A paper describes a structure:
The m1G37 modification also prevents the ribosome from shifting out of the three-nucleotide [name] codon frame (‘frameshifting’) to ensure the correct polypeptide is expressed. The absence of m1G37 in tRNAPro causes high levels of +1 frameshifting on so-called ‘slippery’ or polynucleotide [name] sequences where four nucleotides encode for a single proline codon. To address this question, here we solved six 70S structures of tRNAPro-CGG in the presence or absence of the m1G37 modification and bound to either cognate or slippery codons in the P site. We further show that ribosomes bound to [name]-[name] pairs that result in +1 frameshifts promoted by tRNAPro-CGG result in large conformational changes of the 30S head domain, consequently biasing the [name]-[name] pair toward the E site.
As a control, we solved a structure of tRNAPro-CGG containing the m1G37 modification bound to a cognate CCG codon in the ribosomal P site to a resolution of 3.2 Å. tRNAPro-CGG binds in the classical P/P state (bound to the P site on the 50S and the 30S subunits) and interacts with the proline codon in the 0 frame. Specifically, the G36-G35-C34 anticodon nucleotides form three Watson–Crick base-pairs with the C+1-C+2-G+3 proline codon nucleotides, respectively. The methyl group at position 1 of the nucleobase of G37 stacks with the nucleobase of anticodon nucleotide G36 to form a canonical four-nucleotide stack between nucleotides 34–37. This anticodon stack is important for productive interactions with both [name] and the ribosome. The P/P location of tRNAPro-CGG is thus consistent with functional assays demonstrating that tRNAPro isoacceptors do not appear to spontaneously move into the +1 frame on non-slippery codons. The classical P/P tRNAPro-CGG location on its cognate codon is consistent with dozens of other P-site [name] bound ribosome structures.
Numbering used by the authors:
A (entry chain RD): 2 to 275
B (entry chain R7): 1 to 47
The structure:
Amino acid sequence: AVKKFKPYTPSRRFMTVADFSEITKTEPEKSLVKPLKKTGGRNNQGRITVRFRGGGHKRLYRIIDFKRWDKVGIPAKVAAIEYDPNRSARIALLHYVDGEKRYIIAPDGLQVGQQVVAGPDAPIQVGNALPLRFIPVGTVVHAVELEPKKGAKLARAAGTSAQIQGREGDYVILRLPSGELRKVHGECYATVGAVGNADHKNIVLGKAGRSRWLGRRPHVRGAAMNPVDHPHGGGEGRAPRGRPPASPWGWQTKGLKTRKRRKPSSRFIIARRK
Amino acid sequence: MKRTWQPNRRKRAKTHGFRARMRTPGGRKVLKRRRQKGRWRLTPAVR
RNA sequence: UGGGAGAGGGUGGUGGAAUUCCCGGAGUAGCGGUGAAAUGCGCAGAUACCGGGAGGAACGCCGAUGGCGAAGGCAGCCACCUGGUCCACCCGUGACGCUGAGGCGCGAAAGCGUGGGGAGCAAACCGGAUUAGAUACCCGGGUAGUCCACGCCCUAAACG
RNA sequence: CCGAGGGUAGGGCCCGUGACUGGGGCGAAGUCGUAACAAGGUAGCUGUACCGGAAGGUGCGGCUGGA
RNA sequence: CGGUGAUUGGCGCAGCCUGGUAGCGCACUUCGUUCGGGACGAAGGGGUCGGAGGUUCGAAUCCUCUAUCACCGACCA
RNA sequence: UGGUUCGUGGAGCCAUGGGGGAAUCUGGGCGGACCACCGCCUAAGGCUAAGUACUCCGGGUGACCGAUAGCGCACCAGUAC
RNA sequence: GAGCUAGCCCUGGCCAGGGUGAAGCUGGGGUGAGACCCAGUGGAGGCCCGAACCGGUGGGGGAUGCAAACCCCUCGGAUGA
RNA sequence: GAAUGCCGGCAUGAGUAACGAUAAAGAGGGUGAGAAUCCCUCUCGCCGUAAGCCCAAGGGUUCCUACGCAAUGGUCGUCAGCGUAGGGUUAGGCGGGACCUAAGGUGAAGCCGAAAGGCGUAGCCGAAGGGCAGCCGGUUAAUAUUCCGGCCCUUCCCGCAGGUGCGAUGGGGGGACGCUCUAGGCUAGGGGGACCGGAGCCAUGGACGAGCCCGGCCAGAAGCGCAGGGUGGGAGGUAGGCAAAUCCGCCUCCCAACAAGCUCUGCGUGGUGGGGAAGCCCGUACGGGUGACAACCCCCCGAAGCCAGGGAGCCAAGAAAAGCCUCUAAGCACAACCUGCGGGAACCCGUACCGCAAACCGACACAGGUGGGCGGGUGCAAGAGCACUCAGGCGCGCGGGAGAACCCUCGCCAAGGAACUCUGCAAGUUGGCCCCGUAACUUCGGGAGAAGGGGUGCUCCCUGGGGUGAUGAGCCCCGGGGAGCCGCAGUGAACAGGCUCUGGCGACUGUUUACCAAAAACACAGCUCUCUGCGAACUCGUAAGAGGAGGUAUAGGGAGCGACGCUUGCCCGGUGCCGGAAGGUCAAGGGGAGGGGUGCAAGCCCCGAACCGAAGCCCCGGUGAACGGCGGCCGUAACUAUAACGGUCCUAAGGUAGCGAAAUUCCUUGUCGGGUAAGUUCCGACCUGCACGAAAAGCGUAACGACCGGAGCGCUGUCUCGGCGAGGGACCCGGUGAAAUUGAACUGGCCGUGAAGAUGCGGCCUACCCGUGGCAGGACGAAAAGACCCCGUGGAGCUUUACUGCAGCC
RNA sequence: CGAUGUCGGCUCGUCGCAUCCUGGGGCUGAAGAAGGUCCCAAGGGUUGGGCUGUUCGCCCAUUAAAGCGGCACGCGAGCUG
Ligand SMILES: [Mg+2]
Ligand SMILES: [Mg+2]
Ligand SMILES: [Mg+2]
Ligand SMILES: [Mg+2]
Ligand SMILES: [Mg+2]
Ligand SMILES: [Mg+2]
Ligand SMILES: [Mg+2]
Ligand SMILES: [Mg+2]
Ligand SMILES: [Mg+2]
Ligand SMILES: [Mg+2]
Ligand SMILES: [Mg+2]
Ligand SMILES: [Mg+2]
Ligand SMILES: [Mg+2]
Ligand SMILES: [Mg+2]
Ligand SMILES: [Mg+2]
Ligand SMILES: [Mg+2]
Ligand SMILES: [Mg+2]
Ligand SMILES: [Mg+2]
Ligand SMILES: [Mg+2]
Ligand SMILES: [Mg+2]
Ligand SMILES: [Mg+2]
Ligand SMILES: [Mg+2]
Ligand SMILES: [Mg+2]
Ligand SMILES: [Mg+2]
Ligand SMILES: [Mg+2]
Ligand SMILES: [Mg+2]
Ligand SMILES: [Mg+2]
Ligand SMILES: [Mg+2]
Ligand SMILES: [Mg+2]
Ligand SMILES: [Mg+2]
Ligand SMILES: [Mg+2]
Ligand SMILES: [Mg+2]
Ligand SMILES: [Mg+2]
Ligand SMILES: [Mg+2]
Ligand SMILES: [Mg+2]
Ligand SMILES: [Mg+2]
Ligand SMILES: [Mg+2]
Ligand SMILES: [Mg+2]
Ligand SMILES: [Mg+2]
Ligand SMILES: [Mg+2]
Ligand SMILES: [Mg+2]
Ligand SMILES: [Mg+2]
Ligand SMILES: [Mg+2]
Ligand SMILES: [Mg+2]
Ligand SMILES: [Mg+2]
Ligand SMILES: [Mg+2]
Ligand SMILES: [Mg+2]
Ligand SMILES: [Mg+2]
Ligand SMILES: [Mg+2]
Ligand SMILES: [Mg+2]
Ligand SMILES: [Mg+2]
Ligand SMILES: [Mg+2]
Ligand SMILES: [Mg+2]
Ligand SMILES: [Mg+2]
Ligand SMILES: [Mg+2]
Ligand SMILES: [Mg+2]
Ligand SMILES: [Mg+2]
Ligand SMILES: [Mg+2]
Ligand SMILES: [Mg+2]
Ligand SMILES: [Mg+2]
Ligand SMILES: [Mg+2]
Ligand SMILES: [Mg+2]
Ligand SMILES: [Mg+2]
Ligand SMILES: [Mg+2]
Ligand SMILES: [Mg+2]
Ligand SMILES: [Mg+2]
Ligand SMILES: [Mg+2]
Ligand SMILES: [Mg+2]
Ligand SMILES: [Mg+2]
Ligand SMILES: [Mg+2]
Ligand SMILES: [Mg+2]
Ligand SMILES: [Mg+2]
Ligand SMILES: [Mg+2]
Ligand SMILES: [Mg+2]
Ligand SMILES: [Mg+2]
Ligand SMILES: [Mg+2]
Ligand SMILES: [Mg+2]
Ligand SMILES: [Mg+2]
Ligand SMILES: [Mg+2]
Ligand SMILES: [Mg+2]
Ligand SMILES: [Mg+2]
Ligand SMILES: [Mg+2]
Ligand SMILES: [Mg+2]
Ligand SMILES: [Mg+2]
Ligand SMILES: [Mg+2]
Ligand SMILES: [Mg+2]
Ligand SMILES: [Mg+2]
Ligand SMILES: [Mg+2]
Ligand SMILES: [Mg+2]
Ligand SMILES: [Mg+2]
Ligand SMILES: [Mg+2]
Ligand SMILES: [Mg+2]
Ligand SMILES: [Mg+2]
Ligand SMILES: [Mg+2]
Ligand SMILES: [Mg+2]
Ligand SMILES: [Mg+2]
Ligand SMILES: [Mg+2]
Ligand SMILES: [Mg+2]
Ligand SMILES: [Mg+2]
Ligand SMILES: [Mg+2]
Ligand SMILES: [Mg+2]
Ligand SMILES: [Mg+2]
Ligand SMILES: [Mg+2]
Ligand SMILES: [Mg+2]
Ligand SMILES: [Mg+2]
Ligand SMILES: [Mg+2]
Ligand SMILES: [Mg+2]
Ligand SMILES: [Mg+2]
Ligand SMILES: [Mg+2]
Ligand SMILES: [Mg+2]
Ligand SMILES: [Mg+2]
Ligand SMILES: [Mg+2]
Ligand SMILES: [Mg+2]
Ligand SMILES: [Mg+2]
Ligand SMILES: [Mg+2]
Ligand SMILES: [Mg+2]
Ligand SMILES: [Mg+2]
Ligand SMILES: [Mg+2]
Ligand SMILES: [Mg+2]
Ligand SMILES: [Mg+2]
Ligand SMILES: [Mg+2]
Ligand SMILES: [Mg+2]
Ligand SMILES: [Mg+2]
Ligand SMILES: [Mg+2]
Ligand SMILES: [Mg+2]
Ligand SMILES: [Mg+2]
Ligand SMILES: [Mg+2]
Ligand SMILES: [Mg+2]
Ligand SMILES: [Mg+2]
Ligand SMILES: [Mg+2]
Ligand SMILES: [Mg+2]
Ligand SMILES: [Mg+2]
Ligand SMILES: [Mg+2]
Ligand SMILES: [Mg+2]
Ligand SMILES: [Mg+2]
Ligand SMILES: [Mg+2]
Ligand SMILES: [Mg+2]
Ligand SMILES: [Mg+2]
Ligand SMILES: [Mg+2]
Ligand SMILES: [Mg+2]
Ligand SMILES: [Mg+2]
Ligand SMILES: [Mg+2]
Ligand SMILES: [Mg+2]
Ligand SMILES: [Mg+2]
Ligand SMILES: [Mg+2]
Ligand SMILES: [Mg+2]
Ligand SMILES: [Mg+2]
Ligand SMILES: [Mg+2]
Ligand SMILES: [Mg+2]
Ligand SMILES: [Mg+2]
Ligand SMILES: [Mg+2]
Ligand SMILES: [Mg+2]
Ligand SMILES: [Mg+2]
Ligand SMILES: [Mg+2]
Ligand SMILES: [Mg+2]
Ligand SMILES: [Mg+2]
Ligand SMILES: [Mg+2]
Ligand SMILES: [Mg+2]
Ligand SMILES: [Mg+2]
Ligand SMILES: [Mg+2]
Ligand SMILES: [Mg+2]
Ligand SMILES: [Mg+2]
Ligand SMILES: [Mg+2]
Ligand SMILES: [Mg+2]
Ligand SMILES: [Mg+2]
Ligand SMILES: [Mg+2]
Ligand SMILES: [Mg+2]
Ligand SMILES: [Mg+2]
Ligand SMILES: [Mg+2]
Ligand SMILES: [Mg+2]
Ligand SMILES: [Mg+2]
Ligand SMILES: [Mg+2]
Ligand SMILES: [Mg+2]
Ligand SMILES: [Mg+2]
Ligand SMILES: [Mg+2]
Ligand SMILES: [Mg+2]
Ligand SMILES: [Mg+2]
Ligand SMILES: [Mg+2]
Ligand SMILES: [Mg+2]
Ligand SMILES: [Mg+2]
Ligand SMILES: [Mg+2]
Ligand SMILES: [Mg+2]
Ligand SMILES: [Mg+2]
Ligand SMILES: [Mg+2]
Ligand SMILES: [Mg+2]
Ligand SMILES: [Mg+2]
Ligand SMILES: [Mg+2]
Ligand SMILES: [Mg+2]
Ligand SMILES: [Mg+2]
Ligand SMILES: [Mg+2]
Ligand SMILES: [Mg+2]
Ligand SMILES: [Mg+2]
Ligand SMILES: [Mg+2]
Ligand SMILES: [Mg+2]
Ligand SMILES: [Mg+2]
Ligand SMILES: [Mg+2]
Ligand SMILES: [Mg+2]
Ligand SMILES: [Mg+2]
């Protein structure tokens, strides 16, 4: 539904801004923010650990219920659907009959004024939380825990979904949005529906500075470097890379797998991504 | 044009002062070298 | 007003056979393929058989000189939404009609843009045989594409 | 004031011409191949897309101007 | 001007370091097929091994030196 | 692996990081791989003056210096700068 | 040693004056409904001209300099990375 | 006696260059031993979005005053930011602390590390942010929102008086927030006045005039008045706000839906308090009195400031805690809290002076650099621009003459207009506003200020809109029409684009080598490959821990290409990477056949073959937007020429599309065509591509460019080809007065010679001694122990299939 | 090599002559005019442009002629770059 521009300057001919038609509420709930301490890439040593991060706009952290068994049995009314700047996705404000307000992350086609409930009891319609052992097979789902009682850690970016493909033992088999097949325990909660704002893929930033507003600094190719700094750098000309292509720290970057082989999670993974 | 010394009493005392030596084990030895030489000022003099 | 048929169109959903792939069992020295062969696959355990799983596309018998649509075209099943149409009753309007330069909408397949999907098939490409030579016909692989949503493209032996 | 006309500047149309280039036609009886007419030795034609010295080949769908 | 390689049937090439032999493909040619020609099929010929010298019993083949042949380099001002 | 003169050497001995893992005098370590004989010590707890090193400090002396020397400073010097 | 400089974090401030006139609205036209077309309104932009401010393009001067990077003319950006 | 030796001293250049912005000086009178330089007066010039005021940082006695000039001052000095001495900085309300938290720092708990130390929740520190109670005048030589005067507020603590369950560092609300554009009403500020108050003035031809000139304000409680900001009120139910709540949050019927009502600001008015020019008289340098019993009135423009937490739009979605209100908890309810009154208590530090500069950072009284606020008036369309100029501050701490060359910075020029040159380098042309009009091309926005033109001043007449005003005058902002006037010229000065055609590269704004390169390099949106299932991969770190991320495949990391359009062909033999429970090989370890050393023997101790032994390598496949690569020789067609075609050798395969004398072409100024009188460059083609070619991307592309090339128009001192003029130097006089350099010097030319480029040697020639202004041919001139070359078993930085190790990973 | 700044252009010249022109001459297959060749002769003169960084060279339009060289391939304490 995404919003396009006339070319009245350069870099509005390709600029693209998302549709904010699902958004009802244009300032966040004051009791559910806390300030986001920017890092700039820098760790507790003060050193850059992630290059080319820094800059850009200020942000208050919308604190989100990812662990949704606090409130089993207790339904909730969708007040409002909001911007989160910390996220690809949109967020849903839930007024509870219990009186508390929370942010869940908003699934697609949730609308406003909807009764929505966690639990095992917990009917299978969109927004609701269940353990995976009670959700029917073939249903798409999101906000999935990986181990139980540990917090929603899977399938929560915009437009994403996982999908139940089977049950086997106490574990169910999930189709992850990478394409991975994966044994996830049955008591892991998961929140049914795809996530949406699925037009997030089709945003075109248009100009350089729109990357700076997200805090994305310029990225330097190592071919534009000197060989102190990079394996690729140097060479009195342009150079075809010398060598099999490579990080600043030496390891190759076309093809080299670096999953730890002896990781015990690999006993739970059936099929690597596609 | 802009030169190197652009002074500040907050910067001078919090960097070079007495209490900022006596955190680090290096700067405790600075005062040891400066007791032993005979320094009239162990630390840089700030108002 | 009351009836009737139909693959007429759009949306959502669903069922089975079969191909491919994966897993497990069992099982051997060959399988594919051709006009004949070869490339190829195969004791690193293939073809063939049983059981389990995933995914995509097309829906056999019904079924044809059948039906529907203005044309392109339309085929498993279910519901919803919807168009055209045929008969009867002779009730109402009462000449309201026919055609139609422009315009406007529809328009197989191939193709293009964006995102998804990708089982089988297969332009380009790669082998192997034929041949004087093969950029082809035959064989073995194989990418776009064929599928979906949206927007373009506007063509034909779009033929009765 | 208007004013034939001259001048400046910029556009529109047409004609001749132009290194080189593309296809067209006609030529001596040249070279290469055999595409089509007979089931033309892979039925032909067709819109499209791709490929090949070349006619043309193949994919998709269509047609009976073949069975 | 330096270096290291090649010259072999009409044509494009193998044959050597393991010193004696000279072969393949196309071509040419006699025959056979078709009405004629091409493809096919059967049979055949085809060489100063660029030339000069020695190492030995013996050189296309080993070593010198010439003449063409591509080919690399000719750098720092 | 370190120490020893010992650099893997015939490498003992003395400490050890890792693995195995005893005994109490008929017990155990050592005498330069090892074995036999013959000998010497009694590990896995600790303390212990003197004799030894140095000179911020006081004193004595000099084939030491005498203001470019002697401490960087004879002088308000780790100062001015 | 980050009181210069490079990057980032927290908290504040500055950018005279003019132009261009996007989207979106309102009314009219249009259609079965639209798409769409006119005005008017509106005030977008790593938009334009150009002081502060940030730079340092070309030339001249300066060269034991006013200055261990300067001065004059000219010039780039100037709501944004 | 030498070490470009060390230290100190003194010379040479040399009375030389320079005396620090070309904003500018002259006179009269004082003081004085001594005046261009100090004081006073007059005249002149300069700044005036500053070169004028107020803060902050920094500096730390520089402030004021009296007495002084040895040294500092680029001259002088009686002066000073200098020497001696004395004085000067006054706060409950300004700033900071007995208030709060931010990044960050520290850090009991707790984790880690050979030691030192490294993390780290709460808490604490941490401020130009939040919070908080003072405005205006007058005095000092030097301080004031600080002292005095007037008016007005805040905390505490103790008392009475009246109300309520009081009550926490705990719960809740609030504080509380972005960018851009803005409405209404105010204020600061400014313009005008026939009105008011004023010492005075009619000059030189005219004017006693609604004449000229100066000034017509400030603060100020309550209560009014005007704008505006915040908020709903009752009833129940309640399982959430980590105990409890009447609070908050969530439901459910009722009343307004409004600012009606409550508060809270801002602004006018306000008891009253103060100020009050120009001119004249003066006694100081700085000020005082009168003018004045001062007036203290009316219109107009009007903010970026105030009401403020206003409104609307947009995406990039925009601090925390305390103060404040409310709610309860223990405890307490003879308390405690709230309101009013009264009395009392209110601590520590800073305050002066400079502050775009002679007091700060630059060794200097240095043309450099330095954050925030006010920054008046007129005219130019506007403006913080430009010119002049109030207030205010200055003439920049050497002068006087002269009128050479030469230099710098300006002004003008006959005829020519690029002939100059590497290049129109530089300078010139153009230049603002209003109005006609505007091409190829295009991504439909642009190109566009395209280009090229016309107008611009003043007077008079008629006339249409607005804002404030009551629909009206006046005051202000915009227009139209007609007639005329003057000059060479009307944005009459200053500020203010030269244009066009075409090609290369990069899409574009942007970034970069501070201090020789701003670019075609970097970055960029965008495309692709690859890794990563979360205690993720990757990164720093021994570790703990942290970034990633309080993110989750539409996300994060690495790499390449770098908008967009059409595209990205063939080779997987070698390298890399990915996938293969076979086999070959492979260490410790297992295993012990067999043999050995000693013992009288039980024994003790050594080697040691089969065989079982991982990763890796070998091996088997895949993989190009992974490393990379993409042929050679013969013959053939109705003239030659060429080769669509064929033969053969080789490869892993033999460069397809599209470009091509190119940022790529050696031969080469290839050969044609265009431009030109003439074109090694440019443009368009041909292809014989030494040595293009597809993501180290290929070919194009509108727009953009302080990038690079070619051409033309306009215009010019660039040139033919120079000339004149102006000012700051150069020259002379007075004051102060360096420098690199220097073996010593009594330092000519030619021809020779000499270590081969002679003032110094030989022969000859020439030449009295010493200076000044100039020019650079020599002194192999100066400066830097060549920076190009080589040497040294010199050193660093980088690379790899060099060697050997380490981290890291398996 | 404890430094002798390099190509080309500008400005300024100066010298040699083995002379481009002008001057004087001998031979000519010199009729005349104009040439050719050689000798004597430097006194003076030896243009402006297009291309290229160019020296050189090729063109354009002229000329009486469009001379060759040396001077650190003269000349950067004279300039450019
Ligand atoms: Mg909060
Ligand atoms: Mg920290
Ligand atoms: Mg730290
Ligand atoms: Mg980059
Ligand atoms: Mg580089
Ligand atoms: Mg580095
Ligand atoms: Mg580094
Ligand atoms: Mg490297
Ligand atoms: Mg290169
Ligand atoms: Mg290479
Ligand atoms: Mg490289
Ligand atoms: Mg600081
Ligand atoms: Mg009827
Ligand atoms: Mg009728
Ligand atoms: Mg179609
Ligand atoms: Mg299709
Ligand atoms: Mg498609
Ligand atoms: Mg995409
Ligand atoms: Mg197939
Ligand atoms: Mg096939
Ligand atoms: Mg038909
Ligand atoms: Mg005319
Ligand atoms: Mg045929
Ligand atoms: Mg056929
Ligand atoms: Mg084909
Ligand atoms: Mg077909
Ligand atoms: Mg060199
Ligand atoms: Mg070299
Ligand atoms: Mg040792
Ligand atoms: Mg040892
Ligand atoms: Mg050794
Ligand atoms: Mg041990
Ligand atoms: Mg032992
Ligand atoms: Mg022993
Ligand atoms: Mg012994
Ligand atoms: Mg012993
Ligand atoms: Mg003991
Ligand atoms: Mg001494
Ligand atoms: Mg002495
Ligand atoms: Mg000394
Ligand atoms: Mg800093
Ligand atoms: Mg900094
Ligand atoms: Mg503007
Ligand atoms: Mg509009
Ligand atoms: Mg705007
Ligand atoms: Mg802009
Ligand atoms: Mg600008
Ligand atoms: Mg300002
Ligand atoms: Mg600056
Ligand atoms: Mg810069
Ligand atoms: Mg400059
Ligand atoms: Mg500009
Ligand atoms: Mg610009
Ligand atoms: Mg000496
Ligand atoms: Mg000596
Ligand atoms: Mg002297
Ligand atoms: Mg002199
Ligand atoms: Mg002089
Ligand atoms: Mg002088
Ligand atoms: Mg001066
Ligand atoms: Mg002035
Ligand atoms: Mg201070
Ligand atoms: Mg100071
Ligand atoms: Mg003093
Ligand atoms: Mg003073
Ligand atoms: Mg005095
Ligand atoms: Mg003095
Ligand atoms: Mg003096
Ligand atoms: Mg005196
Ligand atoms: Mg004093
Ligand atoms: Mg205060
Ligand atoms: Mg405190
Ligand atoms: Mg106290
Ligand atoms: Mg605190
Ligand atoms: Mg710490
Ligand atoms: Mg902390
Ligand atoms: Mg504060
Ligand atoms: Mg504050
Ligand atoms: Mg005052
Ligand atoms: Mg004062
Ligand atoms: Mg004060
Ligand atoms: Mg209470
Ligand atoms: Mg609170
Ligand atoms: Mg006023
Ligand atoms: Mg007034
Ligand atoms: Mg007035
Ligand atoms: Mg009056
Ligand atoms: Mg008179
Ligand atoms: Mg006022
Ligand atoms: Mg008042
Ligand atoms: Mg509670
Ligand atoms: Mg209201
Ligand atoms: Mg009041
Ligand atoms: Mg007065
Ligand atoms: Mg607001
Ligand atoms: Mg606190
Ligand atoms: Mg106290
Ligand atoms: Mg003060
Ligand atoms: Mg200032
Ligand atoms: Mg300095
Ligand atoms: Mg001065
Ligand atoms: Mg000073
Ligand atoms: Mg200064
Ligand atoms: Mg100073
Ligand atoms: Mg400034
Ligand atoms: Mg103003
Ligand atoms: Mg002004
Ligand atoms: Mg004005
Ligand atoms: Mg005027
Ligand atoms: Mg203006
Ligand atoms: Mg202002
Ligand atoms: Mg100005
Ligand atoms: Mg004045
Ligand atoms: Mg004149
Ligand atoms: Mg002239
Ligand atoms: Mg003239
Ligand atoms: Mg002209
Ligand atoms: Mg010239
Ligand atoms: Mg020229
Ligand atoms: Mg040129
Ligand atoms: Mg040029
Ligand atoms: Mg210029
Ligand atoms: Mg002009
Ligand atoms: Mg045109
Ligand atoms: Mg153009
Ligand atoms: Mg336009
Ligand atoms: Mg114009
Ligand atoms: Mg143009
Ligand atoms: Mg006039
Ligand atoms: Mg008003
Ligand atoms: Mg102008
Ligand atoms: Mg161009
Ligand atoms: Mg070019
Ligand atoms: Mg660019
Ligand atoms: Mg730029
Ligand atoms: Mg630079
Ligand atoms: Mg530098
Ligand atoms: Mg630039
Ligand atoms: Mg530069
Ligand atoms: Mg792209
Ligand atoms: Mg590590
Ligand atoms: Mg985090
Ligand atoms: Mg990624
Ligand atoms: Mg990435
Ligand atoms: Mg690149
Ligand atoms: Mg190919
Ligand atoms: Mg390969
Ligand atoms: Mg490979
Ligand atoms: Mg392979
Ligand atoms: Mg492997
Ligand atoms: Mg192995
Ligand atoms: Mg072993
Ligand atoms: Mg063993
Ligand atoms: Mg063993
Ligand atoms: Mg290998
Ligand atoms: Mg050319
Ligand atoms: Mg030509
Ligand atoms: Mg030409
Ligand atoms: Mg060309
Ligand atoms: Mg070419
Ligand atoms: Mg090339
Ligand atoms: Mg290339
Ligand atoms: Mg490729
Ligand atoms: Mg490539
Ligand atoms: Mg490129
Ligand atoms: Mg190109
Ligand atoms: Mg295009
Ligand atoms: Mg272009
Ligand atoms: Mg391009
Ligand atoms: Mg540029
Ligand atoms: Mg001139
Ligand atoms: Mg002159
Ligand atoms: Mg003059
Ligand atoms: Mg003098
Ligand atoms: Mg003499
Ligand atoms: Mg000589
Ligand atoms: Mg002599
Ligand atoms: Mg002599
Ligand atoms: Mg002289
Ligand atoms: Mg000289
Ligand atoms: Mg040297
Ligand atoms: Mg060596
Ligand atoms: Mg070495
Ligand atoms: Mg040398
Ligand atoms: Mg020398
Ligand atoms: Mg020298
Ligand atoms: Mg002669
Ligand atoms: Mg003659
Ligand atoms: Mg003659
Ligand atoms: Mg004659
Ligand atoms: Mg002569
Ligand atoms: Mg030359
Ligand atoms: Mg000469
Ligand atoms: Mg020379
Ligand atoms: Mg030169
Ligand atoms: Mg010279
Ligand atoms: Mg010289
Ligand atoms: Mg240059």
